[model samples]
Structure formats: C-alpha cells, structure tokens
Target: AASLVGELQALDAEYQNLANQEEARFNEERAQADAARQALAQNEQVYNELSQRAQRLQAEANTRFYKSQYQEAASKYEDALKKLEAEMEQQKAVISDFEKIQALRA
Candidate 1:
C-alpha cells in the first residue's frame, strides 16, 4: 500500500540496536510462549535480597540510633529507604518493559 519497507528498514535498524536488551528472551511467559515465568519472577530474588539488604542497613542504624548517633542513623535509614524506593522504581520499569515485550506477542 505504501513505501513502508524503505523507511521501516532504517527504523528497524535503530530499534534492533537500541532495543537489544540482554536476557530479554529469558523473561518470556511460560504459558504464553513456552517460556519461563521469569519476566518479573526475577524480581522475586530482587525483593527478597533487597529486603535483607535494607534490614542490614537498618540494623546498622538501629545500633547507631540507640547510641544517640541520631543524625547518622537518619542518614543510614534514609539510604536504605532510598534503596527501597529505587527497587520499586526498578521493578516498575521491568514490568513496563515486560509489557512492551508482551505487546510483540499477544
């Protein structure tokens, strides 16, 4: 109908380069495409480890907090808090990209 192939080839080149995410193939849905459910399942490990990491920092601050290292404890706690937020943002992005990948399928 139109000259889609001409400009589309150029566009695809850019997409092939920029959209080439490592392990993206590993994240496909099992029920959908005979793939594993690791698209966001990988996040399971993340939150599990991330929670423990947050606790480790909080535990450090707990000692400091009780010792009257008040301001220092605040900084330590905030550091862990920011990490928590960043992981939230991160998994959100993963889901976003996961949707993008899903769009290529069903």
Candidate 2:
C-alpha cells in the first residue's frame, strides 16, 4: 500500500507539470490573440478614415460634374477611383455621368 501511494504521488506530480505547461501555453495564446485584436482595431480605424475621405471626394466629384466642371470632377473621380477601387468597381454599373462625359470628350 505504501508503494502504491508513492506511484500515485509521482503521477500527481506529472499531472501538475502538464497542467502548468497547459497554463503557460494558454497565456501565450491569449497574448497573441490580444495583439491580433489590437492590429485589427487599428486597421479598422484607418479603413474608416479612408472611407470617409472617399465619400467626400465622391460627393465633390458629383457636384463638380453637375456644374459641368469636367476637369475638376474627373480629377476628384480619379483620386477616388485610385483610392477606392473595390467600391468603384462594385458601383460601375450605376456610375454613368462620368463615363458619359468621357465618351463625349472622346
């Protein structure tokens, strides 16, 4: 019975070691996750700033185009196009007046 108790104590020590390892790994992973979340938040702030700038440029372009300020309108549109390619691509079908001016000029 004493030998059995010694063996059980050894097993318990091994279990404690494994539990400590698991806790260390959990802490490391949590730190990495927190860093990743911070990076994601930083990226979201930059994306929001760019989006607002794009919206303002687009609004200016539309106003310029309506006032027949083709050069200024085209300039603003070009800036927006360069800055927001994905959004402009999605709106291509509905983007008429600017293209209309381009075709007329051509």
Candidate 3:
C-alpha cells in the first residue's frame, strides 16, 4: 500500500506538470493568435485602401494614354490582393496552432 501510494503521488506530480505545461502552451498560442489576427486586420485595411486608390486611378486612366497609369493601378491592386491572401494564410496557421494548444489543454 505504501509503494502504491508513492507511485500514485509520482503520477499526480507528473499530471500537474503536464497541466502546467499545457496551460503555458495555450497562453503562448493564444497570444500568437491574437497577434496574427491584428496583423491580418491591418493587412486587410491596407489592401482595401489600396484597392480604392487603384479604382480611382483607373477611372482617371480611362480618359487620360494613361495606359501606363492603368498598368500601375492594376499592379497596385494585384499587390494588395497578394498581401491580403498572405495574411489570411498566416491567420489560418495561427488559428490551427491555437486549436492544437487548446486540445492539449483539454
């Protein structure tokens, strides 16, 4: 019985340690997810602004050989779309990490 109690105590300690580690991991992952979300939001805002600017410039381009201007505007629009897509990918990765951490915690 004494040996059994000792073994159980060791297991309890091990469980406690694992719980602490899981909590720490979850906190770290939560912070990372929040940071990624903020970055994604910022990227989205910037992309929207860029798209609007491109649209306005394109309008002027229609009237003006503005062929060069049109090309520039199109380039900016494409760049914004790329940035938005990249940020979305990053956000997904962060969320996946966070969910895994949560699973460990559970």
Return the top candidate by TM-score.
3
Q: Compared with the true structure, what per-residue lDDT tens digits does model 2 show for residues 27-69?
A: 6755655555565556556656766765665567645646446
- Any residue pairs clashing in model 2, and if so which? none
Residue range 1-106, candidate 1, lDDT tens digits: 2688878988998788766653355444323333223434664676577667656655675456364465455556567666756755665666566567777776
Judge candidate 1 at residue 17 and give its lDDT. Answer: 71
RMSD of each: 9.3, 18.0, 3.4
Residue 88 local lDDT, model 3: 80
TM-score of each: 0.36, 0.47, 0.70
For lDDT, the strongest prediction is 3
Rank by TM-score, highest first. 3, 2, 1
Cα-based lDDT for every prediction: 0.59, 0.60, 0.81
Angstrom error of the Cα, residue 76, model 1: value is: 0.8
Candidate 3 similarity to native, TM-score: 0.70
Instruction: Put down candidate 3 lDDT per residue, 32-100, tens digits, no spaces.
Output: 898887887887778788778777777777677767868787778877778778778878788787788
lDDT of 3 at 35: 86
RMSD of 3: 3.4
